[PDB]
Amino acid sequence: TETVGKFEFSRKDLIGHGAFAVVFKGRHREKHDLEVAVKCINKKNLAKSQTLLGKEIKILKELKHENIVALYDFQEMANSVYLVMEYCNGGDLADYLHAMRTLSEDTIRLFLQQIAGAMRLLHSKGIIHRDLKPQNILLSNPANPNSIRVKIADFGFARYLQSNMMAATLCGSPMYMAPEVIMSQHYDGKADLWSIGTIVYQCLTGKAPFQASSPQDLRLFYEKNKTLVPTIPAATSAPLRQLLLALLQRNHKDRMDFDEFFHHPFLDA
Ligand SMILES: COc1cc2nc(-c3cc(F)ccc3O)nc(N[C@@H]3CNC[C@H]3C(C)(C)O)c2cc1OC
Ligand SMILES: [Mg+2]
Ligand SMILES: [Mg+2]
Ligand code: NA
């Protein structure tokens, strides 16, 4: 049993591990029924893991929203970092997708309304996430209609971007990266909108809108194709088709902006 502030966990109770983090289930030390996830350094990638967990603290401690994973506490030291977060008992969207194969438009709508809500807060705070993908979207069953909650997680790559500035760090997951990102160009908040478009397309069809055999091939594809048009099934509703075409614009100046996304007809009741 290890303690972190008012919280504890055992390393027997593994939730999962990736290259840059290990997560365990724990609990509050007084209120044993308050469950938490405790994210810890992955010592196989020590320096990068430590950096990303520190960055995640700096961002998440400023965000309180039902659709963003809550940071209850954290502990940063010279050689260790812990985040104590709300436990998301539903697992991630990637695993849900693996079982469902595809989602109904009504489900896509429910999830995307919640994602949009989170993105409204990020945008108002001047934060870009930079690693939106199904593996970083968690599900939580907290009474009320459609109570399942989506939560954006894994803010290790996130940054503040001043509204008259552009980012240039190459980070993210190639399959979900906007063309401008993977082509090593300057980018802004609309790169995340491409990632979202990609997620929605994947929920709808079970596939990526532009498949390649590698990151290098995908880059070359974007470089050579000045116009990108994803294949949308004929059965797709008109509002969802329009949303996807507007999110999955190659050129960020032609891509849908935040205000249009937040008020898109697809997202209406
Ligand atoms: C109930 O089942 C699960 C709960 C999970 N909760 C969190 C989780 C992560 C947080 F950062 C905070 C709260 C949480 O609950 N994270 C999981 N997996 C993470 C997220 N997707 C990839 C994977 C990893 C470790 C590579 O990042 C869970 C996987 C689960 O099942 C496989
Ligand atoms: Mg991130
Ligand atoms: Mg951009
Ligand atoms: Na802030």
Curated annotation (Swiss-Prot):
Changing K39I: Abolished serine/threonine-protein kinase activity. The modification N6-acetyllysine is found at K151. Ubiquitously expressed. Detected in the following adult tissues: skeletal muscle, heart, pancreas, brain, placenta, liver, kidney, and lung. Residues 9-267 form the Protein kinase domain. The active site is at D131. Autophosphorylated. Phosphorylated under nutrient-rich conditions; dephosphorylated during starvation or following treatment with rapamycin. Under nutrient sufficiency, phosphorylated by MTOR/mTOR, disrupting the interaction with AMPK and preventing activation of ULK1. In response to nutrient limitation, phosphorylated and activated by AMPK, leading to activate autophagy. It comes from the Eukaryota. It is found in: Cytoplasm, Cytosol; Preautophagosomal structure. ATP binds at I15, G16, H17, G18, A19, F20, A21, V22, V23, K39. Interacts with GABARAP and GABARAPL2. Interacts (via C-terminus) with ATG13. Part of a complex consisting of ATG13, ATG101, ULK1 and RB1CC1. Associates with the mammalian target of rapamycin complex 1 (mTORC1) through an interaction with RPTOR; the association depends on nutrient conditions and is reduced during starvation. Interacts with FEZ1; SCOC interferes with FEZ1-binding. Interacts with TBC1D14. Interacts (phosphorylated form) with TRIM5. Interacts with TRIM21 and IRF3, in the presence of TRIM21. Serine/threonine-protein kinase involved in autophagy in response to starvation. Acts upstream of phosphatidylinositol 3-kinase PIK3C3 to regulate the formation of autophagophores, the precursors of autophagosomes. Part of regulatory feedback loops in autophagy: acts both as a downstream effector and negative regulator of mammalian target of rapamycin complex 1 (mTORC1) via interaction with RPTOR. Activated via phosphorylation by AMPK and also acts as a regulator of AMPK by mediating phosphorylation of AMPK subunits PRKAA1, PRKAB2 and PRKAG1, leading to negatively regulate AMPK activity. Belongs to the protein kinase superfamily. Ser/Thr protein kinase family. APG1/unc-51/ULK1 subfamily. This is Serine/threonine-protein kinase ULK1. It comes from Homo sapiens (Human). The lineage of its organism: Eukaryota, Metazoa, Chordata, Craniata, Vertebrata. The gene is ULK1. The chain holds residues 8 to 280 of 1050 of the full protein.
